[PDB]
Amino acid sequence: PEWYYTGSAFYNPEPITLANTRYVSKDTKYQELNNKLPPPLLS
Amino acid sequence: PEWYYTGSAFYNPEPITLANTRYVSKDTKYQELNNKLPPPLLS
Numbered sequence: 665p666e667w668y669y670t671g672s673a674f675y676n677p678e679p680i681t682l683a684n685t686r687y688v689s690k691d692t693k694y695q696e697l698n699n700k701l702p703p704p705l706l707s
Numbered sequence: 708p709e710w711y712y713t714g715s716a717f718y719n720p721e722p723i724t725l726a727n728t729r730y731v732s733k734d735t736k737y738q739e740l741n742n743k744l745p746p747p748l749l750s
Contacts, residue, residue: 687726
């Protein structure tokens with residue numbers, strides 16, 4: 665599926681960028697994206 | 708010497724990545740590295 669970003673105090677889907685994400689270590693509970701990739705995960 | 712990262716509440720050495728480091732200004736008490744470099748410093 666396509667993943668968006670929203671604020672915690674208001675529902676508003678937004679593009680996933682480096683202005684609202686932080687890099688973390690890999691966990692087994694994280695979603696593995698293969699078809700579509702946000703610009704933080706693209707290279 | 709080779710440097711690793713560990714949590715503050717449990718001792719477990721880990722590779723130094725961008726997921727656990729922040730970029731800071733130069734200081735005189737910081738370690739000078741010439742032989743080996745973490746990927747935050749190599750890139």
